[PDB]
Design a protein around this ligand. Structure first.
Ligand SMILES: *[C@@H]1O[C@H](CO)[C@@H](O[C@@H]2O[C@H](CO)[C@@H](O)[C@H](O)[C@H]2NC(C)=O)[C@H](O)[C@H]1NC(C)=O
Ligand SMILES: *[C@@H]1O[C@H](CO)[C@@H](O)[C@H](O)[C@H]1NC(C)=O
Ligand SMILES: *[C@@H]1O[C@H](CO)[C@@H](O)[C@H](O)[C@H]1NC(C)=O
Ligand SMILES: *[C@@H]1O[C@H](CO)[C@@H](O)[C@H](O)[C@H]1NC(C)=O
Ligand SMILES: *[C@@H]1O[C@H](CO)[C@@H](O)[C@H](O)[C@H]1NC(C)=O
Lengths: 710, 17
C-alpha cells in the first residue's frame, strides 16, 4: 500500500524541479499509508497508483527506471515539461499502462524495445523530443496500439517491416524525422490506418502499391521526402480519403488518373513532384475537392473542361508548368472558385467571358503566358476581384475605364502587354490599391489626378510607355515605396511633394523630359537606396540636402544640364556603390571626398566642366572596380602617382583631356582590362602591361603622337 | 487522440513586378 508511494519518492529524487505542491505533498507521514492525495496522483479502487499526471507543470529531471515498480499504472502523463535523459526500458514493465504521453520534453537517446510488453497500451505520444536511433520493430507489435505520434524527433533508419503487424493503428504520425529507406510494402497490412503522416523525412523509392489496401484512409502525407517512381495510387479503396499531399519528391510519371475513385477528396496537392504528362479528366469526378494544386511540375496538355465539374473548387493552382491551350470556359461555372493561378505556363487564346463574369474570383494570376484578347467590360463587374496579374501576355485594347469602381482592387499588374489607350482614373476608387503596374505597354496620355490621391500605392510602375504630361503631387502619409517611370514623355518639374513619402526606397524618373531643379525636399527620403534621374532636361545644382539620404546605394543624374560644385556633404552617403555624374555642366574640380565612401565601386564623372587635375585622393578608393571615367573634363596635369593604388579597377577612361604627362603610373593597375587614353598630351612611351587590349583596341591611344612602341 | 490538423503545401505565392 506504501510501496507505490515509496516508488514515487525514489522517482522524486531524479527530479531537478517540481511544482510547490509536489514539494509539500510528496513525503512520508507516519499517519499516511498511501500517496493517493499527493499532488499529481490518482489511485485505484484498491488504492494503488493508477495515474501520474505532471502535464504543463515546469518539471525538470529524468524519468527514473523505478517507474516500472508501479504495476497498477494506467495513465502516465509527463507531457510538456523540461524532462531530459533517456526513456527507461523498465516502462515496459508497467503492465497496466493504457496512455503513455512523454511528448514535448527533452527526452533523448533510443526508444525502448520493451514497450511490446504493454498489452493494454492504447495511445503513445513521443512527439517533440530529442529522440534518436532506429525504431524498434517491437513498437508496432504493441497489441492494442491505436494512436502513435513520433513527430519532431531525430529518429532514423527504416520504417520497420513490423508495421504490418499493427492492426489497431488508426493514426500514425512520423513527420519531421530522419527516417530513410523504402516505405515497406507491409504498410498495406496495417488495416485500420486513417491518418498517415510520413512527410518531412528522408524516404526514397516508390510509394508502395499496397497503400491501396488501406480502405479506411482519410489523410495521406508523403511530401518532402526523396521519392521516385510512378505514383501508383487510387483504387476502389480511398473512398474515405480527404487529403492527399505528395509535394516535393521526384516522381517519374504523372498525376494518376485512378484518383477518380476517391470521391471524398477535399484537397489534392502535389507541388514540385516532377510530374509530367496530362491533367486527368477523372479529376472532374471530384465534387468535394476544394483544393487542386499541381503547380511546379512538367505538366503538359490542356486543362480538361471536366475540371469545370469540380463544384466545390476553391483554389486551382496550376502554375509553373508546360500547360498549353485555352483556359476552359467551363471554369467560370465554379461558383466557389476564389483563386485561379495559371501563371508561368504556355496558355493561349482569350480568357473566356465566363471567367471574367465570376463573382467568386478574388485572384486571377495568369502572368507569363501567351494569353491575348481584349479586357472585357465585364471585368469591371467582378465584385470580389482583388489581385489581377496579367503581365507578360498578348493582351490588347484599352483597359476598361470603369475598372476599380465595383471596388477593392489591391494589385493590378498588367506590365508587358500590347495595351493601348489611357490609364483608367478609377483603379483606386475602393482605396485598396497597393500595386499599380502598367509598364511596357502602348499606353499614352497623362496620369489621372485621382491616382495621385491613392495613398495605398506601394509600387507604381509606369515605365516604358507613351505617357506624358505633369506628375501628380503626392502626399504625406503616402505609402509609395517603389517608383519607376523611366522611358516616357513626362515633363515639368519633379514634384517636391515626392520627398514627403517617408518609405520611398527607389526612384527611377530616367529617360524623360523633366525640367527645372532637383527638389531639396528629396533630402527627407532616408530610406531611398536608389535614385535615377538620368537623361532629362534637369538644370541647376545638386542640393547639399541630399546628404540626408543615408541609405543611398545608387545615384545617377547623368545626361542633364546640372551645374555647380559637387557638395562635400555627400561624404556621408556611406552606402554608395555607384556614382554617375556623366554629361553635365558640373564644375569646381573633381570632388575630393570620394575616398570617404568606402563602398564606391563605380565612378563615372565623364564629360563635365570639372577642370583642375586628377586628385591624389582619387587613389585611395578601396572598392573601385567596374569603371573610373574622368574623360572629357579639361583635366590638366599628369597622372598622379596614387592612382596606381587601384588594383581592383577593371576599366579606365581618362580620354579627351589636357593631361600632359608620362603614362608611366599605369603600370600599377593590376586588374585593368580596358583603358581609354585619347586626345591627351601624354608624353613618352606606352607602358608594357597595356598590350593585349592595346593589340585589339589600338584606337584607345590616339591623339597622342609621342606614344612609342616596344 | 488530441491535436490540430497538419496543413497541406501552399506552393509559391504569385509574384508581381
Ligand atoms: C515541405 O516543406 C515546405 C517548406 O518548408 C513546406 O512549405 C510550407 O507550407 C506551409 C503550410 O502549407 C506554407 O504556408 C508555408 O508558406 C510553406 N513554408 C515554407 C518555409 O516554404 C511544405 O508545406 C512542406 N510540405 C509537406 C507536405 O511537408
Ligand atoms: C492530465 O491532466 C490534465 C489536466 O487535468 C488533463 O487534461 C489530461 O487529460 C490528463 N492526462 C491524461 C492522459 O488523462
Ligand atoms: C479506379 O481505380 C482503378 C484500379 O486502380 C482504375 O483502373 C480505374 O481507372 C479507377 N477509376 C476511376 C474512375 O478513377
Ligand atoms: C516580360 O515582360 C517584360 C516587359 O516587357 C519584358 O521586358 C521581359 O523580358 C519579359 N520577360 C519574359 C520572360 O518574357
Ligand atoms: C539609370 O537609367 C538608365 C536607363 O534609363 C540605366 O542605363 C542606368 O543603369 C541607370 N543607372 C543606374 C546606376 O542604375
Amino acid at each position: 500500500l506504501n510501496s507505490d508511494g515509496l516508488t514515487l519518492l525514489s522517482l522524486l529524487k531524479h527530479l531537478d524541479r517540481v511544482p510547490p505542491q509536489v514539494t509539500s505533498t510528496w513525503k512520508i507521514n507516519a499517519s499516511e499509508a498511501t500517496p493517493c492525495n499527493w499532488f499529481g496522483i490518482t489511485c485505484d479502487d484498491s488504492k494503488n497508483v493508477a495515474s501520474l499526471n505532471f502535464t504543463r507543470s515546469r518539471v525538470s529531471g529524468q524519468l527514473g527506471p523505478e517507474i516500472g515498480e508501479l504495476k497498477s499504472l494506467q495513465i502516465l502523463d509527463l507531457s510538456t515539461n523540461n524532462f531530459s535523459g533517456t526513456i527507461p526500458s523498465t516502462l515496459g514493465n508497467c503492465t497496466k499502462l493504457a496512455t503513455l504521453d512523454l511528448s514535448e520534453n527533452g527526452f533523448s537517446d533510443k526508444i525502448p524495445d520493451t514497450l511490446d510488453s504493454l498489452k493494454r497500451l492504447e495511445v503513445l505520444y513521443l512527439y517533440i523530443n530529442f529522440l534518436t536511433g532506429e525504431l524498434p520493430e517491437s513498437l508496432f507489435r504493441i497489441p492494442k496500439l491505436q494512436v502513435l505520434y513520433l513527430d519532431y524527433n531525430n529518429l532514423t533508419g527504416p520504417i520497420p517491416q513490423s508495421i504490418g503487424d499493427a492492426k489497431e493503428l488508426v493514426e500514425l504520425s512520423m513527420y519531421a524525422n530522419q527516417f530513410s529507406g523504402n516505405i515497406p510494402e507491409s504498410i498495406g497490412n496495417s488495416s485500420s490506418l486513417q491518418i498517415l503522416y510520413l512527410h518531412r523525412n528522408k524516404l526514397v523509392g516508390s510509394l508502395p502499391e499496397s497503400l491501396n489496401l488501406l480502405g479506411n484512409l482519410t489523410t495521406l502525407f508523403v511530401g518532402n521526402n526523396s521519392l521516385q517512381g510512378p505514383v501508383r495510387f487510387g483504387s476502389p479503396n480511398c473512398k474515405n480519403l480527404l487529403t492527399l499531399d505528395l509535394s516535393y519528391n521526384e516522381f517519374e510519371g504523372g498525376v494518376p488518373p485512378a484518383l477518380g475513385n476517391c470521391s471524398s477528396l477535399d484537397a489534392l496537392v502535389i507541388v514540385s513532384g516532377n510530374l509530367s504528362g496530362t491533367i486527368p479528366s477523372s479529376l472532374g469526378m471530384l465534387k468535394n475537392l476544394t483544393i487542386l494544386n499541381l503547380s511546379e511540375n512538367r505538366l503538359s496538355g490542356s486543362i480538361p473542361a471536366e475540371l469545370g465539374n469540380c463544384s466545390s473548387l476553391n483554389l486551382l493552382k496550376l502554375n509553373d508548368n508546360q500547360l498549353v491551350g485555352g483556359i476552359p470556359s467551363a471554369l467560370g461555372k465554379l461558383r466557389k472558385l476564389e483563386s485561379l493561378e495559371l501563371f508561368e505556363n504556355r496558355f493561349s487564346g482569350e480568357i473566356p467571358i465566363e471567367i471574367w463574369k465570376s463573382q467568386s474570383l478574388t485572384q486571377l494570376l495568369v502572368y507569363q503566358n501567351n494569353l491575348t484578347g481584349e479586357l472585357p467590360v465585364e471585368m469591371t463587374e467582378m465584385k470580389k476581384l482583388k489581385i489581377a496579374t496579367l503581365f507578360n501576355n498578348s493582351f490588347y485594347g484599352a483597359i476598361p475605364p470603369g475598372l476599380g469602381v465595383n471596388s477593392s482592387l489591391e494589385e493590378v499588374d498588367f506590365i508587358g502587354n500590347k495595351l493601348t489607350g489611357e490609364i483608367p482614373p478609377n483603379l483606386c476608387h475602393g482605396r485598396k490599391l497597393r500595386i499599380l503596374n502598367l509598364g511596357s505597354n502602348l499606353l499614352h496620355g497623362t496620369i489621372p489626378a485621382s491616382i495621385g490621391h491613392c495613398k495605398t500605392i506601394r509600387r507604381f510602375i509606369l515605365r516604358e510607355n507613351n505617357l506624358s504630361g505633369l506628375l501628380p503631387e503626392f502626399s504625406q502619409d503616402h505609402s509609395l515605396s517603389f517608383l519607376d517611370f523611366n522611358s516616357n514623355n513626362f515633363e515639368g518639374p519633379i514634384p517636391g511633394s515626392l520627398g514627403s513619402c517617408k518609405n520611398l526606397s527607389s526612384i527611377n524618373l530616367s529617360r524623360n523630359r523633366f525640367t527645372g531643379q532637383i527638389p531639396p525636399q528629396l533630402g527627407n527620403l532616408q530610406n531611398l537606396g536608389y535614385m535615377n534621374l538620368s537623361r532629362n532636361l534637369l538644370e541647376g545644382s545638386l542640393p547639399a540636402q541630399l546628404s540626408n539620404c543615408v541609405s543611398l546605394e545608387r545615384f545617377d543624374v547623368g545626361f542633364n544640364s546640372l551645374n555647380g560644385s559637387v557638395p562635400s556633404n555627400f561624404s556621408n552617403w556611406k552606402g554608395l556603390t555607384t556614382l554617375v555624374l556623366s554629361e553635365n555642366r558640373f564644375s569646381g574640380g573633381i570632388p575630393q571626398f570620394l575616398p570617404e565612401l568606402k563602398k564606391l565601386s563605380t565612378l563615372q564623372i565623364a564629360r563635365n566642366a570639372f577642370g583642375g587635375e586628377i586628385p591624389s585622393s582619387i587613389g585611395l578608393i578601396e572598392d573601385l572596380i567596374y569603371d573610373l571615367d574622368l574623360s572629357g573634363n579639361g583635366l590638366t596635369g599628369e597622372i598622379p602617382a596614387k592612382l596606381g593604388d587601384l588594383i581592383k579597377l577593371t576599366r579606365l577612361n581618362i580620354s579627351n583631356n589636357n593631361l600632359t604627362g608620362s603614362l608611366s603610373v599605369l603600370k600599377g593597375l593590376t586588374s585593368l582590362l580596358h583603358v581609354d587614353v585619347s586626345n591627351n598630351q601624354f608624353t613618352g612611351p606606352i607602358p608594357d602591361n597595356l598590350e593585349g587590349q592595346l593589340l585589339s583596341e589600338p584606337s584607345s591611344f590616339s591623339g597622342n603622337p609621342n606614344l612609342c612602341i616596344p | 487522440k488530441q491535436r490540430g490538423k497538419e496543413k497541406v503545401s501552399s506552393g509559391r505565392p504569385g509574384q508581381h513586378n
